[PDB]
Structure formats: structure tokens, C-alpha cells
């Protein structure tokens, strides 16, 4: 019934720049102040920054600021690291022991535009023997995030028989990789000559092709 | 002092499901135990929370399918009921101080998957360029590894790269479309006598067994 | 359809301030992103700044960071380039570019002639 609602779902400020998160809820917290705030990243359980609105939590660096009091909640991330790239929550405990945490804000580090170095992979003969071939394009290191992946099989656009994979950004250089899988048939894959990945992005001044051909490497 | 949560595993829609989470250093005679779970790209969500005197208090969407219990003095259960694929979560417990979910102790997780798919290891090939396509005064190059058509997560790519130094990456897992089975990238960038090195990706798959282990040895170019 | 004419560009010493300004006209380029780039004679075409919709920022390239600042003036269809402490580096044909691409992919379809930048 009763909502916690975090804003904004995404964030972006620079190394030494400063976010704000705003957590508001339907109904005041318990006590006015029980509400805690969590960052976490991939594949990990979230760690705890602050609790009772504005406690900081052992641990958790000084630049960690939480301020609110009622239903209107505030965490303030001060002087940015490229270790911060994560998405964070905040946790309201209400009156009939309730937990409800929000709906996450990813914060990502603004940093200069970086071209992607695009490589192609042709699918390997041990995996033709099966009756599937991959073809592989790589996009590496990069930002912003936004890119367009295009499939050429012998001059023909490519729809529906490919999948991207991002990675989430560098804790280092704060720039993304990204992959897409072009998956054919094997009676598919031996008809074709011509295998190209067309990789367009704001950093380029036009669009930058690799391509193979079957059988030539 | 720490958490562990253990029993996250594949099973049908409509199997119950039993989680443990055993604790080590603290006592639960103080101590409450707190279950969050997180579905796969998506948020953090409350689930309940047990008290020292053995209460159980849970979430408005949990309905009685959960159930959690204290079964001996370092281990906690959580037992689920009319599981479907939206059950499908990396599930936490974490040493609760009061009846608030905010606590700096947290258990790595444990991954449950719902579905009707079948337990499928996963083939591994190996991911080279063109070598007419790579510069001759190439100092460094990339390679990889492409572990698809496994179900359920993870896998886990390790590297061994003789005497070299490189580094890994592997990237997020991607549902195929038309099987529903996972594929990952794991990619290695070396530098220096690439050439004549012989490199190795060791892709793990818990799930299938403990000790299922694939070892794909290769070099950069098949001269 | 839309045309990019530039303009602004000219000789100026080390140190000194330009402001370029890139009007279309044609489509209303208030949903589009609008970049920069350089090209100096024989050398290859190199991002500088892009100014994506009002809300949504604005991104450098590393080399021009803390010195040009990119901005936009919706209302008359024309995004500038305000060029401060200019090196004998930023010596180059200066083009300008709308991202066809809604979702700021780089689908840059769309160019202008070019304006001279002179930095001795």
C-alpha cells in the first residue's frame, strides 16, 4: 500500500562534482528518522553508508551525506570518486515492523568522450561442428554508454539474431565495454562470404566497419 | 563475523524451496536475521525478518509463501512455497540489529532460479581475430573465450596465461532467445610474445557439479 | 531538408576567444544532439563537444575540457561553441553536426561547411 519513491533512477557528475538522491515516502518512517542508505555494485551484497537518516556508518567515508527527517529523505554524495559508480537505495522502516526499500538511483561518473576500438571474432571451427556459428563484436572502452551495433551478412542488415551485453562502468578510466553475439545456423553461416559489424558512436566521425570473410582468414 | 546463505538452486514452478543462512561469530539469542532478495537486474526487495524469540514478521506481497525458522544456534531457514519465474533472485540474509533492515553485515547471496528448463553445462570455444587482420608490430592483442548455451548462472572464467601478465574481463550474461539458456564473454588482453604463447580459460559451472571445469587451450594464430 | 551554415571563425592569437555559431535551418534541431568536430588539413576528422537536449548535458572531448564550452539557443535552431585559451593545437576547419539518432548514438547524417579556426 504505502510507497518509497527515489528520485532520479539515474545520475551523472564528474570526478569532484557532487549528486543528490531524494528518497519521499506515503507515510512518515519510524520514529521520524529510521531510514538507512545502501550502495551496491555487481554481484555484490549492498553496504550500508548511513542510517537513522543521518548517522554515517563505520566505515563509510566523510564525503557520505544524509540529511531528512518525516517523509522527505536526502543522500548527498560530495567530492566524487570514479569508485562511486554504483547504484544506490535507500531502506524506510515503518510502524508494523515494514521494510520497504526504493526503487534505486544509478549514479554514473561523467568523463571525456572516448571512442570504442571495435575487434571482430569469426566463429571457431569447434564450435561449426555443432551446427551453430557465433560471430562476435567487440566495443572497448568507451563513454558515454550510447553506441549502435549494425550486422552486415553479405551487404544484408541483420535484424532479430543478435544480442548486446554491456559491463558496468570502469571503477579506473569509468569507460563501458560492450559485446554483441550474431548467432546463425551453421547451413546459414556456410552461405554467406561477407561478415561486417558497423559500429556507430558519438565520438566518431562516421561509422567504422570490421569485416572477415568465411574461409579467408 | 560474517553470513553465509546456502540452498539456492533450479527447480520447477510449484517446488518448495528451502534456504539456509549460517551464521558464524554472533549469536542469535541477540541478533535478528533479516531476508532481502534482488532479481536479476532489478532492486533490492524486503522480504521478512525473525526475531530472537522466533517471531516472524514479513512484507504485504509475501502472502504466507514465506516462512522462516530457526533451526539451530548458527543457521536460519527460509522456506518458500508457489514458486514461480518471478521467484527468480539472488536471495541475502543479514544480521538484523532491530526490526529495521539497516545493518552493515550482509550474507554474499545465494541464486535461485525458477524455471522449466533443463540443467546444461555449458560449451566453450575460443574467441580469436582474423590473423591477416592483426598488425604484424602488434604489441598487445585480444583474445577470448565464449561460454553459451548454459542454464542456469553462473559461470566462472579464470585465465592462465603462462608468463605473461594480462587482464580479464568478462562480461554480463545474456539470455539466449530462442533456448533461454545464458552466454558469457570472458576476454583477456596480453602483452608481449603473444605469438608463440599458448593460453588457456578455465570456465566453472557450479550448478552442473562442483568440480565441473573446462579447460579451452589455444594460441592467438593456427600457423 | 535542414542546412548547417557556421560561422564565427577567423585568426586570433594565443590565448584569445572565439565563439562559434552553427544555425540550421530547415528541421527544428531541439530533438536532436548537435557536435562538434575538427578537421586540420591532412590530418584526420576529431571530436570536440557535443550538446545533447536541453537537460540531458553536454560532453568534451579530452584535449578541449576546461577550455570550450558548447551550448544551445533552441529558439533559433543554433548551438555555439564558446572556444577560450586557445592553443596553436585547435588550428583546424571546424564542422559542425546533428546526431540523427534520438537516443545519441553518433548517427551523424547531417554536416556543415566548416569555419576556419587560425591560432598564431
Known amino acids: 500500500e504505502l510507497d518509497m519513491t527515489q528520485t532520479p533512477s539515474s545520475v551523472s557528475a564528474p570526478v569532484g562534482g557532487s549528486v543528490t538522491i531524494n528518497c519521499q515516502s506515503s507515510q512518515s518512517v519510524y520514529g521520524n528518522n529510521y531510514l538507512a542508505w545502501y550502495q551496491q555494485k555487481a554481484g555484490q551484497p549492498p553496504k550500508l553508508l548511513i542510517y537513522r537518516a543521518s548517522t554515517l556508518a563505520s566505515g563509510a567515508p566523510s564525503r557520505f551525506k544524509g540529511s531528512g527527517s518525516g517523509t522527505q529523505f536526502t543522500l548527498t554524495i560530495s567530492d566524487l570518486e570514479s569508485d562511486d559508480a554504483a547504484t544506490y537505495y535507500c531502506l524506510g522502516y515503518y510502524n508494523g515492523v515494514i521494510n520497504v526499500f526504493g526503487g534505486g538511483t544509478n549514479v554514473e561518473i561523467k568523463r571525456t568522450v572516448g571512442a570504442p576500438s571495435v575487434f571482430i571474432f569469426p566463429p571457431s571451427d569447434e564450435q561449426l561442428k555443432s551446427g551453430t556459428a557465433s560471430v562476435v563484436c567487440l566495443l572497448n572502452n568507451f563513454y558515454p554508454r550510447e553506441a549502435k551495433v549494425q550486422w552486415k551478412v553479405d551487404n544484408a542488415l541483420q535484424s532479430g539474431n543478435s544480442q548486446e551485453s554491456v559491463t558496468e562502468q570502469d571503477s579506473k578510466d569509468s569507460t563501458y565495454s560492450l559485446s554483441s553475439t550474431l548467432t546463425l545456423s551453421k547451413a546459414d553461416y556456410e552461405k554467406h562470404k561477407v561478415y561486417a559489424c558497423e559500429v556507430t558512436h558519438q565520438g566518431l566521425s562516421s561509422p567504422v566497419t570490421k569485416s572477415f570473410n568465411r574461409g579467408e582468414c | 563475523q560474517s553470513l553465509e546463505e546456502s540452498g539456492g538452486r533450479l527447480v520447477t514452478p510449484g517446488t518448495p524451496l528451502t534456504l539456509t543462512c549460517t551464521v558464524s561469530g554472533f549469536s542469535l539469542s541477540t541478533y535478528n536475521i533479516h531476508w532481502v532478495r534482488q532479481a536479476p537486474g532489478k532492486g533490492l526487495e524486503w522480504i521478512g525478518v525473525i526475531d530472537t524469540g522466533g517471531g516472524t514478521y514479513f512484507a504485504s506481497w509475501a502472502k504466507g509463501r514465506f516462512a522462516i525458522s530457526k533451526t539451530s544456534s548458527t543457521t536460519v531457514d527460509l522456506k518458500m512455497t508457489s514458486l514461480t519465474a518471478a521467484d527468480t533472485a539472488t536471495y541475502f540474509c543479514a544480521k538484523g540489529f532491530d526490526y529495521s533492515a539497516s545493518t552493515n553485515l550482509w550474507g554474499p547471496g545465494t541464486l535461485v532460479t525458477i524455471s522449466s528448463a533443463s540443467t546444461q553445462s555449458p560449451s566453450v570455444f575460443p574467441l580469436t581475430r582474423c590473423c591477416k587482420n592483426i598488425p604484424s608490430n602488434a604489441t598487445s592483442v585480444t583474445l577470448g573465450c565464449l561460454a553459451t548455451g548454459y542454464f542456469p548462472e553462473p559461470v566462472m572464467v579464470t585465465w592462465d596465461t603462462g608468463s605473461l601478465n594480462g587482464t580479464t574481463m568478462t562480461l554480463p550474461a545474456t539470455t539466449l532467445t530462442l533456448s533461454g539458456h545464458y552466454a558469457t564473454i570472458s576476454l583477456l588482453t596480453v602483452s608481449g610474445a603473444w605469438a608463440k604463447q599458448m593460453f588457456t580459460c578455465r570456465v566453472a559451472h557450479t550448478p552442473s557439479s562442483t568440480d565441473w571445469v573446462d579447460n579451452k587451450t589455444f594460441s592467438v594464430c593456427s600457423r | 531538408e535542414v542546412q548547417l551554415q557556421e560561422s564565427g571563425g577567423g585568426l586570433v592569437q594565443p590565448g584569445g576567444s572565439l565563439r562559434l555559431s552553427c544555425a540550421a535551418s530547415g528541421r527544428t534541431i531541439s530533438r536532436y544532439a548537435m557536435s562538434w568536430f575538427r578537421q586540420a588539413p591532412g590530418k584526420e576528422r576529431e571530436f570536440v563537444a557535443t550538446?545533447?537536449?536541453?537537460?540531458?548535458?553536454?560532453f568534451y572531448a579530452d584535449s578541449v575540457q576546461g577550455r570550450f564550452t558548447v551550448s544551445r539557443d533552441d529558439a533559433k535552431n543554433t548551438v555555439y561553441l564558446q572556444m577560450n585559451s586557445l592553443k596553436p593545437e585547435d588550428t583546424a576547419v571546424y564542422y559542425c553536426?546533428?546526431?540523427?539518432?534520438?537516443?545519441?548514438?553518433?548517427?551523424?547524417?547531417?554536416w556543415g561547411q566548416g569555419t576556419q579556426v587560425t591560432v598564431s
Open positions: 550538446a545533447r537536449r536541453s537537460g540531458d548535458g553536454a
Open positions: 553536426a546533428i546526431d540523427s539518432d534520438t537516443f545519441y548514438s553518433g548517427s551523424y547524417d547531417y
